[PDB]
């Protein structure tokens, strides 16, 4: 609590896990390479005000 | 009045007074549930006699119990209150107001047996006698030491808590969690001292 007193919490309170839910994402096993693709437009379009 | 004894092989035989004292009044409640009669010589008159094969027949007494325990189980014995085994004989060496081992000879008879009860059960898959839960409060007195001592003990990690509580709460001293093995072990390994 600001630093100041530390909360009333008993010692066994705090060895209790936190569980959460969560997205993650892995390359799956044998896979030699990862490609990666996108593409770009390129417009002359700082010559005149919209 | 006075002790005066000489060639004292029993174990009521020896001391000062007060632990002399400390011994008639736990023979009396344990064996002398007659309801008072005013028998006050002839009720006591017989504790000596009875103390002369004590090295031999306390330990005969606390056996009997545990197979008639056994037989009326209900629940998996990891789960089982030490007292429901017992039936208070820690509390009672409370009476004798000394606290250390070599004085409080009932005590150390106790523990005699316990050692022993421990030693030819060792773990297995299926939970057995020696898995049983005691309070904070009977490790209190077979360690021979005050409870605050047994938090301290706990909180730095010399022994392991076996039930889980809830939140927001705390474990007062009558609920049942360490087990005996894990108590005696540890009594053994650095308790001792020269008394």
Redesign the interface.
Known sequence: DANLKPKNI????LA?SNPQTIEACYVPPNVDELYCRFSLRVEANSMRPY | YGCSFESSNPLLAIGSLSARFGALYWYQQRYLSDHEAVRDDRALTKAIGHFTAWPDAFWRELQQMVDDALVRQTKPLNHTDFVDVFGSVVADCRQIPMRNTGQNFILKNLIGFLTDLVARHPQCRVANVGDLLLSAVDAATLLSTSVEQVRRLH?EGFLP?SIR?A?RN?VSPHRAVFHLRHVVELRQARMQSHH
């Open positions: 008993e010692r066994y309170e209790y | 909180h808590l509580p939140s705390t």
